[PDB]
């Protein structure tokens, strides 16, 4: 097609959806704040205005046609674009120094390019939400309401815990009733953070704890995730680099780490244990299908959504927790130092690992979890060229791992490791792998003896629902909450789209290829660990196994009138439903409020409002000390309060 852009002949393309994308394909860029990630849509920024036939319109919603005269730059368009940008910046929390998107923010770059040096509009105040109760931190004062996180959570992750609320100037992306993210069904996959174009969604930074620990007298022990080494090179803007982990070891030892281990060893150990457990389940044909528990986001999702499948989850804990428990409970004894003296630092690509390390069943094992970005910040602080750092190997005895263990970093890693363990223990005649969908792979496996099973690998939460609803012919299911596995984790370097994730997977595959030993049993150190420390089943169960509990919201959220923050009280609740309101309840509430106004000097009495208690038809109801009265009134509640 031939079009005229600013008076010059331009050939865009044969078939195109809109003018903006066609021109971008040509190489002509129109400023806009809509295309911000892979989960972006068009129409909200309104900054892509072009002029055609006299009238101005958005180029993202304009279907191109043959020989169309379009002016992309006119004084009116400059005025409108600068006005829109100033409108965005007027109510934006402009503190970039402490922002997590500092230096990689499109809004910041536009503010620089557009020469905005003063706010012509008023920085009006909003009812902003600041949620810091979870490793995923929400700050709606930096939100531009692009809606990418909502689409990511709903369409891509299948959880839908964050949505647009209210309207107009008060429009806000938040959880229901402004509930803290830690208390919602959020699985903390961190994908919303990975797609957020501003600092509104960010990861909780815990570098201060690490620095104060290094400065102390405790023995600091580090362990690096397999997928951290496959993506850290992006933060420094250098090419892929095998041996990244060993120069990371060198740097960590330089900044004061006493020991540095490889979480791939924990991955090998977990794969061995889970292979044996799955074989027992197969021979018994019970607790099937089996689910891998290596992804904490998927584990929490199952606890929230599949309480009936919690018995199907693998008892084996994740590589991080397995290796950390092994360290704290065995390595400490071997070194003759109390467990309190060891400070354990985990370098992960995942935000859900921060939650996992703080779980009650894992209390005190992993002291702090630092994401890939925090490790990159640690490196950048020192200002040493990591590319020039001479690599040195991991520390013994948890430094070596098999290729299968390092494969954990991407989707299908744990399933392949389990398959290798089983093959070594009992050969595998053949494996047939099918691809029903993009992120779902099903493998049919036949063992040498003759017993066969089916295994499925599912990466990307939200695809699990349909597969579990329609497919019931599998015995083991691998679930990874993030697309492409951990190479696309929440804590990975930004941007974190599909192309970079595929490149990270390629880098991790290249790193795997240069590993000599191929299966966990070939790992001599792991077999020595089993023979010396995990010889018996009781110690092995207490070290490598965990239990899961169902999750269900416990919302009381009764109407507060005269609350008492704490201390023994009476907690009188007055029903505010229509049936109860139809006679008395509101009058009774007024009388009780005035009573505690004249009496009840201290917080002995707590006057609350509550919704229908499913006792209608029995006169107004007044709950006292969580007790039903019926036919309640001021005197009938006073007598009980006595």
């Amino acid at each position: 097609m031939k079009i005229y852009v600013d008076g010059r002949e331009v050939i865009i393309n044969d078939n195109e959806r809109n003018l903006l994308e066609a021109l971008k394909n040509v190489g002509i860029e129109i400023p806009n704040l809509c295309y911000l990630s892979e989960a972006s849509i068009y129409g909200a920024c309104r900054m892509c205005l072009v002029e055609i036939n006299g009238q101005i319109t958005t180029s993202c919603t304009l279907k191109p046609y043959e020989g169309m005269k379009v002016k992309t730059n006119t004084p009116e368009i400059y005025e409108m674009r600068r006005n829109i940008l100033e409108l965005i910046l007027a109510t934006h929390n402009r503190d970039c120094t402490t922002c997590d998107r500092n230096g990689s923010c499109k809004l910041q770059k536009y503010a620089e390019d557009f020469g905005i040096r003063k706010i012509r509009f008023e920085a009006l105040k909003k009812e902003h939400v600041r949620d810091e109760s979870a490793p995923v931190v929400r700050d709606t004062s930096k939100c531009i309401l692009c809606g990418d996180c909502v689409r990511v959570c709903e369409e891509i992750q299948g959880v839908g815990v964050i949505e647009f609320a209210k309207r107009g100037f008060e429009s806000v992306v938040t959880t229901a009733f402004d509930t803290p993210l830690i208390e919602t069904e959020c699985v903390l996959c961190g994908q919303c953070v990975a797609y957020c174009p501003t600092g509104a969604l960010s990861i909780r930074n815990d570098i201060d704890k690490l620095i104060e620990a290094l400065e102390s007298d405790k023995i600091v022990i580090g362990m690096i995730a397999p997928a951290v080494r496959a993506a850290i090179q992006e933060e420094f803007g250098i090419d892929e680099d095998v041996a990244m982990a060993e120069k990371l070891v060198s740097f960590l030892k330089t900044i004061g780490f006493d020991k540095v281990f490889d979480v791939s060893f924990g991955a090998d150990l977990v794969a061995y244990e889970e292979a044996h457990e799955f074989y027992e389940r197969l021979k018994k044909g019970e607790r099937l299908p089996q689910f891998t528990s290596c992804c904490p986001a998927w584990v929490k999702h199952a606890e929230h959504t599949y309480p009936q499948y919690l018995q199907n989850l693998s008892s084996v804990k994740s590589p991080q927790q397995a290796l950390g428990t092994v360290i704290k409970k065995i390595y400490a004894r071997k070194l003759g130092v109390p467990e309190e003296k060891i400070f354990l630092v985990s370098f992960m690509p995942c935000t859900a690992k921060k939650f996992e390390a703080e779980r009650e069943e894992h209390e005190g094992i992993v002291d702090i979890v630092l994401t890939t970005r925090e490790l990159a910040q640690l490196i950048k602080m020192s200002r040493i060229d990591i590319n020039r750092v001479e690599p040195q190997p991991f520390d013994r005895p948890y430094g070596v791992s098999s290729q299968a263990g390092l494969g954990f970093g991407k989707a299908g890693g744990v399933f392949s490791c389990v398959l290798s363990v089983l093959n070594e223990e009992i050969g595998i005649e053949k494996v047939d792998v099918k691809s029903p969908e993009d992120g779902i792979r099903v493998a049919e496996v036949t063992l040498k003896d003759g017993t066969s099973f089916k295994g499925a690998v599912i990466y990307g939460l939200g695809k699990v629902k349909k597969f579990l609803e329609e497919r019931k012919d599998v015995e083991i299911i691998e679930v990874m909450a993030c697309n492409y596995g951990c190479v696309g984790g929440g804590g990975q370097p930004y941007p974190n789209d599909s192309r970079i994730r595929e490149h990270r997977a390629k880098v991790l595959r290249d790193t795997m290829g240069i590993k000599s030993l191929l299966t966990p049993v070939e790992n001599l150190f792991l077999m020595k660990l089993y023979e010396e420390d995990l010889k018996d089943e009781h110690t092995r169960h207490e070290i490598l196994h965990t239990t899961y509990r169902p999750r269900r919201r416990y919302p009381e959220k009764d109407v507060e009138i005269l609350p008492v923050p704490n201390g023994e009280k009476r907690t009188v609740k007055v029903c505010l439903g229509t049936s109860c309101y139809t006679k008395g309840s509101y009058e009774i509430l007024k009388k009780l409020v005035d009573y505690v106004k004249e009496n009840d000097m201290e917080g002995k009495i707590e006057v609350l409002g509550t919704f229908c208690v499913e006792n209608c038809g029995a006169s107004p109801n007044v709950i006292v000390d969580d007790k039903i009265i019926g036919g309640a009134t001021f005197e009938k509640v006073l007598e009980e309060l006595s």
Binding site: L562, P563, P565, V596, D600, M601, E602, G603, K604
Partner: protein, 311 residues
């Protein structure tokens, strides 16, 4: 201007800004020429040494701190003024024999030996000979010669706050550590003296003190947190008492006063539960006013207030 480089800059008619010392003032001082800088007392000593002999001059003092030292002793004492004592004299001797003890109603709690750049001493260090070498391995020093006694009726957190206020005022503003950290530490101490502190604030104060001590350009900043470090090491308990309650000595609460902040008071109960004098008599649901006529200033209200508003 007591800093050598700052002194030389101020003699030249400029701002008394100190500078790094690769070219020590002895090799190049005023306008780049070699300069000798000494205190008044040293110059006074010189003629005394020349008039006497080396052994005659060393007959009084210590094998490493020969001679004498002139002190100005202040604080509540029966006799305060300029004193001259041989090196090696203990602080008990100065405070009780040369100053005649304390005035009635005053006891001994601590003493400052070098002002802001000095150190805080307690009853464990009072009996120690005053020697240049001895005090260095004691977290102390003889100092310039200023001695002020601290009684049991004064708060040590207030002492540290006062010294940090002085240092914050006197900082020349050249290097980031002193200029900014002294203000930040003074703000932390100001919060401490108003019952707004927390354990996190104490940790921040400690780490910031270490940073200021290590990174400051000149001696003023390096010794700026000396009162903080000494007072912490010797009265951590007083610091805690300020964190989880009121001032043990009453100095902070003596002339201060408790006021309920209606901006963040939703009129809950409590308050009266512990208040022995029942100085609340508030209106339920609305902010609870604190009757100051009968407020003994016990400080229990702040100790337990879920919505911290006891200002």
């Amino acid at each position: 201007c007591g800093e050598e480089t700052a002194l030389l800059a101020s003699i030249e008619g400029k701002r008394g800004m100190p500078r790094p010392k690769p070219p020590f003032p002895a090799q190049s001082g005023l306008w780049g020429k070699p300069t000798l800088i000494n205190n008044v007392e040293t110059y006074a000593n010189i003629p005394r040494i020349l008039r006497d002999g080396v052994e005659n001059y060393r007959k009084r003092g210590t094998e490493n701190s020969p001679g004498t030292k002139m002190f100005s002793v202040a604080g509540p004492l029966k006799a305060t003024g300029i004193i001259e004592v041989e090196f090696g004299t203990t602080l008990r001797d100065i405070i009780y024999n040369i100053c005649g003890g304390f005035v009635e109603g005053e006891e001994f709690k601590a003493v400052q030996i070098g002002g802001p750049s000095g150190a805080c001493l307690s009853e464990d260090f009072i009996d120690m000979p005053l020697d240049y070498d001895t005090l260095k391995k004691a977290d102390a020093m003889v100092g310039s010669g200023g001695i002020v006694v601290i009684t049991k009726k004064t708060c040590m957190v207030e002492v540290a706050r006062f010294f940090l206020d002085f240092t914050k005022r006197e900082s020349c503003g050249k290097c980031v550590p002193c200029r900014e950290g002294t203000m930040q530490a003074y703000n932390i101490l100001e919060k401490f003296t108003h019952g707004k502190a927390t354990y996190e604030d104490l940790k921040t104060l400690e780490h910031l003190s270490k940073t200021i001590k290590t990174a400051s350009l000149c001696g003023l900043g390096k010794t700026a947190p000396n009162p903080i470090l000494s007072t912490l090491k010797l009265f951590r308990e007083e610091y805690i008492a300020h964190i989880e309650g009121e001032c043990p000595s009453g100095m902070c609460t003596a002339f201060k006063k408790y006021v309920i902040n209606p901006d963040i008071c939703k009129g809950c109960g409590l308050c009266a539960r512990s208040c022995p004098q029942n100085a609340i008599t508030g209106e339920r649901g609305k902010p609870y006013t604190i009757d100051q006529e009968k407020c003994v200033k016990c400080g229990l209200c702040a100790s337990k207030c879920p919505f911290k508003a006891i200002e």
